[PDB]
Symmetry: C4
Subunit: 510 residues, 4 copies
């Protein structure tokens, strides 16, 4: 057991993220149930009995039929010992759970004690060094000590004598929120489908908000006499107690939740304020809503917005194009051909310009990603395989995928060669004179367009396309600009030797 005294925690383990998730469950526990325990003291308990009165006029106890359709509100008369004698299982449950959550807080604090802080990229896991880092950071001990007084035990509804119980004291536990943030932040970055999680979270915000606010309605409604006017919960406003509904805990939470729902989303179909104090409230609360919920739902909207912003960008680009063609009265054949290009461009979803990977990432990560992705396709290329050098490691960074429509000339005889293409998919044939030539077909992995780039003129043609290469269907090519090939080629003269060695043999035929 002595090993668990000098034990140090690494912040960067998956297990720890599981733990932070646990702290999170404890947190939500408190901020959901504590306040509600404070307001609806009917919950743990009750700590008193109903004393409803029926003529035929003695005060009686509570009968589930006499808590319906009441003339006046039921007087709350307190027990001799309020509590545990009548209700035992319940209170014991709540103590087990609170005790549990608090255990989570404690264990979390022990881990905070041994948190392997990070000195220059490495995790420092040490005996006295870590604890040193703890107490040198005064904030750790300050907030950390603040939420574990366990003052709630003394504020709980126990004792039986002279104390109602202030469960609201548990609110001090709410100051550990930083841990919870560090959880959610790290959960988005894990989730396969982020915007899913990211929307679920926000729905929870709304529900807790609405919750607390409901509790506020009910508390304020307790503070003012409950059943003394048409705005405070109770028989006086017929909205909450229609005649045939029976009074309960469930009802109160239900109606209060409904009330808060409306006021916070400004439908406002709620019985109107009757005391200056209430106007104070309802206005505060209505304004609070027109700002709070404005922003909130203007974020849910933005979230479901940026979700499929790819598609939005796309339809933008395209509509631009089509507009341009309608106004300038281009042919029908050409316009059709274009829109077919876009269609196939988007039904393959290879349309991703990858400028994401380019810009945001470190250069090295671009190399390994593109490596894996195009790995098999390049694996069947003469040029990259032949050179011992990982020159490929250079060129991968700068290859751009271009899609060509079917039956269309990639190349024409007697044209300037600037690019050199490597086929990712589709098959294309070398032809001259609109057929009857040697239809030579290159499949994926093949290399062409290289004769012009390499400045060799055995037949004296020059930077001219020797043949004209045609596509048979929708073909995707890697495009490597002359400048890049050459700027990279000085570094590896062997590749020069091999590529030129092939080039002499291709120009030999001519």
């Amino acid at each position: 057991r002595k090993y668990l005294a000098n034990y140090t925690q690494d912040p960067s383990t998956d297990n720890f993220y599981y733990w932070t998730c646990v702290v999170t469950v404890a947190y939500i526990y408190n901020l959901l149930f504590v306040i509600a325990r404070q307001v609806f003291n009917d919950l743990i308990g009750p700590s008193s009995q109903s004393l409803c009165r029926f003529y035929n006029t003695t005060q009686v106890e509570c009968t589930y039929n006499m808590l319906t359709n009441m003339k006046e509100m039921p007087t709350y008369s307190q027990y001799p010992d309020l509590g545990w004698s009548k209700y035992w299982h319940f209170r014991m449950l709540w103590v087990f759970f609170d005790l549990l959550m608090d255990c989570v807080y404690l264990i979390d604090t022990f881990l905070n004690y041994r948190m392997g802080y990070m000195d220059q990229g490495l995790v420092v896991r040490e005996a006295e060094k870590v604890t040193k880092a703890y107490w040198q950071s005064k904030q750790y001990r300050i907030d950390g000590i603040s939420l574990i007084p366990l003052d709630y035990i003394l504020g709980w509804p126990i004792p039986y004598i002279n104390w109602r119980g202030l469960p609201i004291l548990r609110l001090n536990r709410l100051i550990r929120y930083k841990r919870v943030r560090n959880c959610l932040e790290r959960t988005e970055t894990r989730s396969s489908m982020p915007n899913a999680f990211r929307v679920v979270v926000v729905v929870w915000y709304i529900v807790i908000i609405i919750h607390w606010n409901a509790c506020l309605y009910f508390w304020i409604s307790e503070w003012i006499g409950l059943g003394t006017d048409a705005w405070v919960y109770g028989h006086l406003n017929k909205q909450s107690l229609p005649d045939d509904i029976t009074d309960t805990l469930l009802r109160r939470y239900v109606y209060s939740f409904y009330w808060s729902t409306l006021i916070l989303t400004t439908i406002g179909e709620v019985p109107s304020p009757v005391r200056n104090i209430e106007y104070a409230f309802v206005t505060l609360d209505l304004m609070c809503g027109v700002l709070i919920f404005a922003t909130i739902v203007g974020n849910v909207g933005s979230m479901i917005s940026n979700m499929s912003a790819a598609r939005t960008e796309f339809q933008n680009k395209m509509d631009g194009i089509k507009q341009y063609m309608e106004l300038r009265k281009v042919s029908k054949q050409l316009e059709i051909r274009v829109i077919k290009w876009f269609d196939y461009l988007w039904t393959n979803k290879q349309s991703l310009s990858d400028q994401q990977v380019l810009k945001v990432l470190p250069d090295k990560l671009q190399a390994e990603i593109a490596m894996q992705v195009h790995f098999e396709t390049l694996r069947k290329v003469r040029i990259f395989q032949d050179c011992e050098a990982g020159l490929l490691a250079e060129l991968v960074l700068k290859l751009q995928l271009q899609v060509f429509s079917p039956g269309d000339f990639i190349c024409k005889k007697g044209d300037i060669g600037r690019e050199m293409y490597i086929v990712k998919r589709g098959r294309l044939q070398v032809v001259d004179d609109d057929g009857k030539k040697v239809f030579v077909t290159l499949q994926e992995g093949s290399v062409f367009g290289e004769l012009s780039i390499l400045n060799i003129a055995g037949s004296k043609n020059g930077n001219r396309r020797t043949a004209n290469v045609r596509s048979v269907g929708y073909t995707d090519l890697f495009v490597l600009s002359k400048t890049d090939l050459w700027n990279a080629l000085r570094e590896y003269p062997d590749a020069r030797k091999l590529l030129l060695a092939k080039g002499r043999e291709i120009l030999k035929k001519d």
Copy 2:
């Protein structure tokens, strides 16, 4: 008929898009009418009779005057055989239509069997290969089999004995939605006016949404006793049955549709909830609305937004300009002149920078588009026509249209020549000394500004404008930077020969 056994379907035909459109009509059929058939069982049928009671106190049948202004809700008493004996035409109709839709589903599945998948840009239309692709893709047979059990026939209101009918089983047909998406996606990209279609679609979403939700109101309202409180449809809430209105199917759908309209757009002018279960509902539904419709209508807004975003961008640029001139106290003549420039720039709508075509498209498509568009205008140019080479094919990519105000010097004597202009429209005159010179007028298609770019100095003037060219009205010029002309000119020395051959003859006069 054996030819229709080995028949294979091409995904890329116009006819197929017509077909997918048909599948679409079947889909909408189901998701509109199925659920409603489930809820309003009054529709197919009814399967029972009304049994309203009037004193003077025997239970009677239904009279269209006694279904108005009722004291209590009508008891539904079931037929001996519920159904087809009394109503025949109707049920037969619904069976013909369901059977029809199902035929569409079946034919669609046979086409799915023979779907010519695309291997490397070409469509593979083959006997066993295609079917191989079907069953290798386990998802095809999984979802495809799932929606055609035809289980509805066994769940339909038939039999007469012991079965009410669960039309809701037909819901399994809803899982073919992917086909419908592939339709809409392909319809936007076809439509001449996209944003039209794109708005119509969204209006349909809203209506189906509102629809289902209405059905939900009515179902939930059936499940709770119908006419037992002030929130469930029926005589109890005077909103739906005002005294003089008669009860009907039409009414129910109408009121329920209205109700859903309000709750989903949070006007919420609707009789308030009376049972805890209903609060549960209405809150669920209100929140559901404040998110669902928030986003939806925040998209209709965005759609009508980006529609004419051209114009918005424009007014932005301009307001910037005008602001700049007011603050810096520029003259009145100059400011007027500018705003006239913008006016004519926007009344011709040739203001499109075409950077759409530039950026989004493949380079080759830019060439053919601009080819067709400027085709006639360039068709009357000496330089492009004279050279046998399709050098034009190079330059078309890099020509920028510049608009010049009337009476203003394009060129002045003794200035650096950097550009070379080709006139798209307007006419402009060569003049020296503010008139009395040889007013030489070039119309569209003409070429000038070329003497300075070509580094020839027979009179030793240099990269200097020989004359000063003036515009007579609003003239549009093609602008070709020196660097481009030259970088392109090395490739075709013949064009050099001809252009210089003209240049010597123009400088000969001087």
Copy 3:
């Protein structure tokens, strides 16, 4: 008068814009008053008398006290001749005005006949050519003929016998809207304060929209029996006729306008629908509103948004900066100094990067604008004034204004000279050794930093700052990069001669 037969109109005159503005007033006339004349036939007229009945039970005429607090709606009993005998001034007014508006339409059509269309930048003002252009464009005669049948005269409430009058026929005049657009488009581009006008316009849209819709409420309310239920205007719904209010035209338009206001902005505090037909309406209308007004007010918001987007961009940039400095724990002195830089940068509003003028405008317009603006400041510069060449015309395009904080070294001894500064405002002193040197002060218009750029080394110092120049307050400098000065300097060797001629004389001292 024969001169007014062959008279041709120029589209590009200020007078014409005044005219289009007039056509606009006629347009608004029609789309505001026509529909209302159609609905509230009380307006022109009435064409009948009230026939209210009071017991003590004969039908009587209308008394302004008996049209209040009514038991039942007043029966409309028609005149023997309905109209002009009782009311004369009014109807004559409406005919004078309609006739007037129609005159505007006619004159507009004669101008359309003679509209000088624009052939290649110049306005073609000709006898038969213009008319040729009219009838060759079939649309001109089609829409143009369509709105002037004058069919209204035959549909007016006259005749006395057998005709009620269909003023709604005048709706055909609404098809000239294109002219009105061409007005507003041209008014924004004129207005000194655009966003003012641009907001006023939109407020008019809202009001006309709300208007028509009100008329719709009232029409539909006429079509259904007026005063037969709690949703149609009239004594039945106590919202419109509270007991003490008297019935009038004014009331109807007022209440209907209010009603439409609510339904179109979904407050919806309006008596609820009572007939299936009405639900049809109100839903149609509510949805119509949640889309129409969503967009509309989401545009008013966007308008008041982009208005002062300068300021928004600014606060963005700055908050970024301050954030950066807080996190990285920079000093206090430095941070203060920065924020003072921004303050003075924004209190002078010379902060405009002018990239508006740069990007959007033609290159020539940038030259003349900047010419005028900096005209006086440059007018007092040795270098620009001395050279006969308008070389300035080159450099003006590429000068960037840089603001420097007070007391801070623009230059330090022994540093690389890359830029050359010209002072726009402030005064700065040449000093060495933190004072006690020759404090030489350059005011605006002065030129310095030029010794290093010009590659002259008589003392062999090189591209080194000879002295160190210090600012006394907030000084604004023109900045001209070495590359620009030089690239421009090859073109004018005289400027070289003069600048170097000064340079030898400044380096002479050393």
Copy 4:
């Protein structure tokens, strides 16, 4: 005291900003309390007594129990001398405060007299020059004189005879608003947390707006007979005076504030208009709200939006990345590694590209900022410390921080050297053959990658990495591209001498 006659004020002192803040408090004073004093004349006073009547039917005075549950509104009967005899403390208070605020206005005007205007970057503090600048600017004396007539004293409720008092005259003070703007503008630019202040301000706007509007409701409600219908405040609409609430000033302001809250945020749960005039009002006011508040709350939303737009941008970039990796089916190991890179990138918040500082700021400020920040880190570098020249001053502008994942090769043997790295944090070891070499570890401040950049080949290796450098954890490097190092190195040949002097000694080992 004569020194305070020729005393001139500097606009650019902290004290002055304190003063403007004071003027601000006076301003808010007026625009909050003046209008309310005008409307609720109950406030200062009252100037009359209540005269409520109770049968058992003589008119009596006011009793706080008889101002509850009234049958009819209380008649206001005026005093013989209305005012100061009965209420003294109050009125004296208001006069002291108004007089105070006015003193602020006066002192502000004296400061305006002596405002040191800024001529060419320097503050001109002079005797007659400043006053000259005052009166030459006619606007100063125009608006400045306009708000200090002190006309309020003559409009105050005094005199006792024949005057009710028009406090509203004080409105003329509202025209000094420019000063207040110049305060707020300068407060944002000071505040550490801007968006805090920026939101608080907007909440004040809303409250003042709502305020005035409330006053408007109440004024209009006074103008119409108060307690004559169900829309004007008073016993007639049971919303404001429910039976048990007593009538007061407090109530009026409360209810009116509530009313305005609803109408301006279109909840609109308010008793409906009863006179044509009121419809006029409420519609005006409702429309006014649907525009005013639309924009306002669409700004609070935008404010809380751009607040943490860093984080939004980040999640955008990342989600892009993860999407890309899911679709293209990259490995699990690589994907994990990436997301860990992002995690550590964002948990250090050193992720700021600093392009803010780059773009927005002057070049010199970038130098000093980065100087301070990286000061200690660079303070321990051989290269920068050794060279006497402040060459560092050059390179600081162009160093980019790159983060590398742990255990990953920064360098590999036999690769092109393009960059040269300086370690900001982390430690990394030089190793060959996957261990067993000389593990040489560089800590922060160290310099490497320099051998390849400097074109020296004593062993003939060339621009090749001699060793392969590996990281042990998450290491941050300064990256200096070859082009930059060299372009900067020509300027200081000494640095060349030293760096090469080290290079020979490192290549000596090999």
